[PDB]
Enzyme design. Structure first.
Site, PDB file in Angstrom:
ATOM      1  N   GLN A  27      48.866  47.987  29.255  1.00  0.00           N
ATOM      2  CA  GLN A  27      47.940  48.941  28.694  1.00  0.00           C
ATOM      3  C   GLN A  27      48.189  48.985  27.192  1.00  0.00           C
ATOM      4  O   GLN A  27      48.899  48.113  26.671  1.00  0.00           O
ATOM      5  CB  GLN A  27      48.061  50.297  29.394  1.00  0.00           C
ATOM      6  CG  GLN A  27      47.736  50.249  30.886  1.00  0.00           C
ATOM      7  CD  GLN A  27      46.306  49.891  31.215  1.00  0.00           C
ATOM      8  OE1 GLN A  27      45.451  49.777  30.334  1.00  0.00           O
ATOM      9  NE2 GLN A  27      45.973  49.703  32.491  1.00  0.00           N
ATOM     10  N   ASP A  68      40.336  38.492  38.808  1.00  0.00           N
ATOM     11  CA  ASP A  68      39.417  39.022  39.788  1.00  0.00           C
ATOM     12  C   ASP A  68      38.217  39.660  39.087  1.00  0.00           C
ATOM     13  O   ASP A  68      38.310  40.127  37.951  1.00  0.00           O
ATOM     14  CB  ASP A  68      40.023  40.087  40.704  1.00  0.00           C
ATOM     15  CG  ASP A  68      40.033  41.438  39.999  1.00  0.00           C
ATOM     16  OD1 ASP A  68      41.029  41.744  39.307  1.00  0.00           O
ATOM     17  OD2 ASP A  68      39.063  42.212  40.121  1.00  0.00           O
ATOM     18  N   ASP A 106      44.741  46.382  44.590  1.00  0.00           N
ATOM     19  CA  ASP A 106      44.874  47.164  43.345  1.00  0.00           C
ATOM     20  C   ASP A 106      45.470  48.522  43.735  1.00  0.00           C
ATOM     21  O   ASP A 106      45.471  48.878  44.912  1.00  0.00           O
ATOM     22  CB  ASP A 106      43.578  47.307  42.561  1.00  0.00           C
ATOM     23  CG  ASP A 106      43.733  47.629  41.084  1.00  0.00           C
ATOM     24  OD1 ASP A 106      42.711  47.567  40.357  1.00  0.00           O
ATOM     25  OD2 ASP A 106      44.843  47.944  40.585  1.00  0.00           O
ATOM     26  N   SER A 107      45.983  49.254  42.763  1.00  0.00           N
ATOM     27  CA  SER A 107      46.775  50.456  43.013  1.00  0.00           C
ATOM     28  C   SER A 107      45.928  51.701  43.260  1.00  0.00           C
ATOM     29  O   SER A 107      46.446  52.696  43.760  1.00  0.00           O
ATOM     30  CB  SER A 107      47.747  50.710  41.856  1.00  0.00           C
ATOM     31  OG  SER A 107      47.121  50.807  40.595  1.00  0.00           O
ATOM     32  N   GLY A 108      44.647  51.661  42.913  1.00  0.00           N
ATOM     33  CA  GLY A 108      43.756  52.773  43.133  1.00  0.00           C
ATOM     34  C   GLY A 108      43.321  53.558  41.918  1.00  0.00           C
ATOM     35  O   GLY A 108      42.167  54.002  41.825  1.00  0.00           O
ATOM     36  N   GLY A 109      44.184  53.789  40.936  1.00  0.00           N
ATOM     37  CA  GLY A 109      43.848  54.622  39.798  1.00  0.00           C
ATOM     38  C   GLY A 109      42.692  54.130  38.955  1.00  0.00           C
ATOM     39  O   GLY A 109      42.245  54.832  38.047  1.00  0.00           O
ATOM     40  N   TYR A 110      42.180  52.934  39.217  1.00  0.00           N
ATOM     41  CA  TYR A 110      41.064  52.379  38.459  1.00  0.00           C
ATOM     42  C   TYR A 110      39.735  52.911  38.992  1.00  0.00           C
ATOM     43  O   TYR A 110      38.935  53.502  38.269  1.00  0.00           O
ATOM     44  CB  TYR A 110      41.086  50.845  38.508  1.00  0.00           C
ATOM     45  CG  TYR A 110      39.933  50.231  37.748  1.00  0.00           C
ATOM     46  CD1 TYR A 110      39.975  50.102  36.368  1.00  0.00           C
ATOM     47  CD2 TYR A 110      38.801  49.797  38.424  1.00  0.00           C
ATOM     48  CE1 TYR A 110      38.920  49.545  35.673  1.00  0.00           C
ATOM     49  CE2 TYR A 110      37.739  49.238  37.736  1.00  0.00           C
ATOM     50  CZ  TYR A 110      37.808  49.117  36.363  1.00  0.00           C
ATOM     51  OH  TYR A 110      36.750  48.562  35.681  1.00  0.00           O
ATOM     52  N   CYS A 128      28.992  23.160  47.581  1.00  0.00           N
ATOM     53  CA  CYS A 128      28.987  24.140  48.675  1.00  0.00           C
ATOM     54  C   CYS A 128      27.942  23.839  49.736  1.00  0.00           C
ATOM     55  O   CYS A 128      26.942  23.128  49.612  1.00  0.00           O
ATOM     56  CB  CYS A 128      28.841  25.553  48.075  1.00  0.00           C
ATOM     57  SG  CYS A 128      27.178  26.219  47.966  1.00  0.00           S
ATOM     58  N   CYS A 188      24.390  24.799  48.867  1.00  0.00           N
ATOM     59  CA  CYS A 188      23.629  23.804  48.116  1.00  0.00           C
ATOM     60  C   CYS A 188      23.413  22.521  48.895  1.00  0.00           C
ATOM     61  O   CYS A 188      22.570  21.696  48.552  1.00  0.00           O
ATOM     62  CB  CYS A 188      24.332  23.462  46.797  1.00  0.00           C
ATOM     63  SG  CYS A 188      24.337  24.878  45.664  1.00  0.00           S
ATOM     64  N   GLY A 213      43.097  47.149  31.225  1.00  0.00           N
ATOM     65  CA  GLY A 213      42.344  47.889  30.233  1.00  0.00           C
ATOM     66  C   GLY A 213      41.416  47.086  29.362  1.00  0.00           C
ATOM     67  O   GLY A 213      40.908  47.610  28.363  1.00  0.00           O
ATOM     68  N   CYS A 270      26.826  21.364  42.721  1.00  0.00           N
ATOM     69  CA  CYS A 270      27.628  22.161  43.624  1.00  0.00           C
ATOM     70  C   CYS A 270      27.834  21.516  44.986  1.00  0.00           C
ATOM     71  O   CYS A 270      26.871  21.044  45.601  1.00  0.00           O
ATOM     72  CB  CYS A 270      26.923  23.509  43.841  1.00  0.00           C
ATOM     73  SG  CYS A 270      28.050  24.640  44.679  1.00  0.00           S
ATOM     74  N   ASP A 281      48.876  52.802  37.567  1.00  0.00           N
ATOM     75  CA  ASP A 281      48.642  53.033  36.169  1.00  0.00           C
ATOM     76  C   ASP A 281      47.523  54.067  35.974  1.00  0.00           C
ATOM     77  O   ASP A 281      46.843  54.407  36.936  1.00  0.00           O
ATOM     78  CB  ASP A 281      48.257  51.745  35.433  1.00  0.00           C
ATOM     79  CG  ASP A 281      47.018  51.042  35.966  1.00  0.00           C
ATOM     80  OD1 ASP A 281      46.581  51.264  37.115  1.00  0.00           O
ATOM     81  OD2 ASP A 281      46.451  50.224  35.201  1.00  0.00           O
ATOM     82  N   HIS A 315      27.472  30.691  47.694  1.00  0.00           N
ATOM     83  CA  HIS A 315      27.351  29.789  46.558  1.00  0.00           C
ATOM     84  C   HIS A 315      28.165  30.274  45.374  1.00  0.00           C
ATOM     85  O   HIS A 315      28.890  29.541  44.698  1.00  0.00           O
ATOM     86  CB  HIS A 315      25.855  29.665  46.152  1.00  0.00           C
ATOM     87  CG  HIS A 315      25.782  28.970  44.830  1.00  0.00           C
ATOM     88  ND1 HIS A 315      25.973  27.620  44.727  1.00  0.00           N
ATOM     89  CD2 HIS A 315      25.574  29.439  43.566  1.00  0.00           C
ATOM     90  CE1 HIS A 315      25.875  27.280  43.455  1.00  0.00           C
ATOM     91  NE2 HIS A 315      25.648  28.372  42.736  1.00  0.00           N
TER      92      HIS A 315
HETATM   93  N1  LIG Z   1      40.157  47.157  32.307  1.00  0.00           N
HETATM   94  C1  LIG Z   1      40.453  47.217  33.692  1.00  0.00           C
HETATM   95  C2  LIG Z   1      40.699  46.873  34.931  1.00  0.00           C
HETATM   96  C3  LIG Z   1      39.794  46.378  35.940  1.00  0.00           C
HETATM   97  N2  LIG Z   1      40.843  46.600  37.041  1.00  0.00           N
HETATM   98  C4  LIG Z   1      41.771  47.347  36.565  1.00  0.00           C
HETATM   99  N3  LIG Z   1      42.963  47.748  37.487  1.00  0.00           N
HETATM  100  C5  LIG Z   1      44.161  48.954  37.188  1.00  0.00           C
HETATM  101  N4  LIG Z   1      44.874  49.106  38.234  1.00  0.00           N
HETATM  102  N5  LIG Z   1      44.264  48.983  35.660  1.00  0.00           N
HETATM  103  C6  LIG Z   1      43.047  48.459  35.100  1.00  0.00           C
HETATM  104  O1  LIG Z   1      43.484  48.513  33.649  1.00  0.00           O
HETATM  105  C7  LIG Z   1      41.891  47.605  35.388  1.00  0.00           C
HETATM  106 ZN   LIG Z   2      26.392  25.803  45.768  1.00  0.00          ZN
END
Ligand SMILES: N#Cc1c[nH]c2nc(N)[nH]c(=O)c12
Ligand SMILES: [Zn+2]
Ligand SMILES: N#Cc1c[nH]c2nc(N)[nH]c(=O)c12
Ligand SMILES: [Zn+2]
Lengths: 361, 361
Positions: free
Chosen positions: A181, A258, A92-96, A298, A301, A208, A296, A134, A327
């Site tokens: 966004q 994610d 991820d870019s970091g700004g979150y 795994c 389990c 977002g 499951c 972002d 798990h």
């Molecule tokens: N809602 C939310 C998100 C959870 N990861 C996020 N990652 C960035 N880079 N922007 C975001 O809008 C979100």
């Molecule tokens: Zn399992």
């Protein structure tokens, strides 16, 4: 393998199944990416992560830049070599996390991140899928603030695009995704999608929608937002989510996910089952010899009981976190395989209906 | 396999190498037993424990009786099934941790343990090697108090012997070891050995030498204490210890060891190397790409660097504990293999000399 090739093998309604080919390997879609925040998927060896079925993991710009440092990781060979994961990584870019864990048009200074530094850190890490930098937008947000934030993000998206493109090694070996966004407003979402499609990216995230929206509101926004994105590129829903969110999101056109839910809530005692989530710390499991989940496949389990894992978590034993997390990630991956298989066979709508009825029984 | 058969294959001075055959498997001696206190060797899966080379692990009477409860574990199938370790287990009797973590001739009540209850708990757990219930003796101790404590222990040893023998399932399937006491006094040690040998056990521990004695004092007491024990039975030094203690103890006739040093100190940042211990949190490792140890054949040293493990521990990541603990236990097992191999070849005295010179370089 190409730098980047997304191919759709089958469809059902808005849902899609296929693959993303990258130099470091193939990603089956729809995909779930385990989150690894400080160069580790918590309590799991990389090999264990792979054994659950994960094709790709997510790493975090904000965290690694702070500890152990981006330049340091590059010096040591890059994130893949450092942590022992040789397959794709999305960063991820970091700004979150900066917004959650000094804001201007240039970027943000905190206790610096700009589009340019973000893109460079991700490069230093050796990321395979680079996220545009972002401005996340809080929920709720007034239209004017959402508009302002969205517009900045689109300017930052263009800056991200150019910083990436300028670094030949990065542009020839990695991919770049832009992030949509606009809060929950259809017009702003349309404007953002148009702007991103005009810049042009390898993939499109829906940003977002994981900052407090309930599932109903999130789905209604996906309902209009995802068809605005180019159909022939992957659609990534950031920070989503629970099994039922994932099913409904795929039904709306999402290809990638994610979430920290299965690792984080796993270490807190919450185990996912096809019959819904259970809190293994509950006294009802103290002598329960059944596996965490009835079906499951795994290792966890296969080998241990609820009662054992109950004891370990109550005792705060590290093995408890280990097994809960293995798990839960295995469960998420199996859900993803059942979604993929069911779309490939034209029975995903039946699968989503059946999943829900049981999961919420 | 027999219930119990100890056979010595080779000797050098006071040192011995051989095997203990038991129904659940073979134990190579001299042996190191990883300690697992709440039905887990901390931060390791049983399979990982086995992969390092461990033949047998130690479980704790005091801890499991408290959590999750002895009767509960029996109900659930016994300690082996519960935790996923199908090989031998040695259980301590409890009176050690009770003293460290209402004392009479009957036993002890704390916030009950007697020889009879101890032996029963160990049975309930399904232990393979049952430890007699003793009164540990603090260090230092006056001769009179040491004498008194030793004598009680010998009375408790006889009671342990009979409670074990009375339970046909236990007596036919497990083994029983007696524990020598007497602090550091040769006469009391002689009396205790004689008393234990008259009762008769499958193995003999040297108790009371891990409660603050420095290595010099511990060795001088082993010097006279171990030849008092029957030669044809295993000699077990309880709660010892550091690599150098283990080497010197084997040179004095000891066959079995347990210690929390490699797990506990592993999670605290201390890694064992043939060049001596290192604290991986130290800044000198932040960019050290070498494995924890130059020659170690463990998976950890095969795959990750000092710098990575440095980062994980500084970050308090669970994977850091996992990898530190796997290395350290692997190291201990490799030391044990080198001791076994060197005695089998009549070069253990050369090995002990060489080990020391390097370890303390
Ligand atoms: N809602 C939310 C998100 C959870 N990861 C996020 N990652 C960035 N880079 N922007 C975001 O809008 C979100
Ligand atoms: Zn399992
Ligand atoms: N010194 C010491 C020991 C560390 N474990 C111990 N175990 C019991 N049961 N007796 C003991 O003397 C000791
Ligand atoms: Zn190693």
């Amino acid at each position: 393998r190409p730098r980047f090739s997304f191919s759709i093998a089958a469809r059902e309604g808005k849902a899609r199944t296929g693959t993303i080919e990258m130099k470091r390997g193939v990603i089956r879609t729809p995909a779930f990416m385990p989150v690894g925040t400080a160069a580790t998927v918590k309590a799991l060896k990389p090999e264990t992560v792979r054994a659950t079925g994960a094709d790709i993991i997510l790493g975090n710009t904000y965290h690694l830049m702070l500890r152990p440092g981006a330049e340091r990781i590059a010096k040591l060979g890059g994130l893949h070599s450092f942590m022992g994961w040789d397959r794709p990584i999305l960063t991820d870019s970091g700004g979150y996390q900066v917004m959650s864990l000094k804001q201007s048009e240039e970027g943000v200074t905190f206790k610096m991140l700009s589009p340019e530094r973000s893109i460079e850190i991700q490069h230093l890490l050796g990321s395979d899928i680079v996220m545009a930098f972002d401005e996340c937008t809080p929920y709720p947000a007034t239209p004017s603030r959402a508009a302002s934030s969205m517009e900045r993000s689109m300017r930052w998206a263009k800056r991200s695009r150019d910083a990436f493109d300028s670094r030949k090694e990065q542009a020839e070996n990695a991919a770049l995704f832009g992030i949509q966004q606009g809060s929950v407003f259809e017009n702003l979402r349309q404007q953002s999608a148009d702007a991103l499609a005009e810049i042009g990216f390898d993939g499109y995230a829906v940003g977002g929608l994981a900052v407090g929206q309930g599932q109903d509101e999130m789905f209604r926004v996906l309902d209009f937002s995802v068809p605005m994105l180019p159909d022939d590129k992957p659609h990534y829903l950031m920070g989503v989510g629970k099994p039922d969110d994932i099913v409904g999101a795929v039904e709306r056109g999402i290809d990638m996910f994610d979430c920290v839910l299965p690792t984080r809530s796993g270490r807190n005692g919450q185990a996912f089952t096809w019959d819904g989530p259970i809190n293994i710390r509950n006294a009802r499991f103290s002598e329960d010899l059944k596996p965490l989940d009835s079906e499951c496949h795994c290792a966890v389990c296969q080998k241990w009981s609820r009662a054992y894992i109950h004891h370990l978590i109550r005792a705060g034993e590290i093995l408890g976190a280990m097994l809960m997390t293995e798990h839960n990630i295995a469960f998420y991956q199996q859900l993803m395989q059942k979604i993929r298989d069911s779309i490939s066979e034209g029975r995903f709508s039946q699968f989503a209906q059946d999943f829900r009825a049981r999961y919420f029984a």
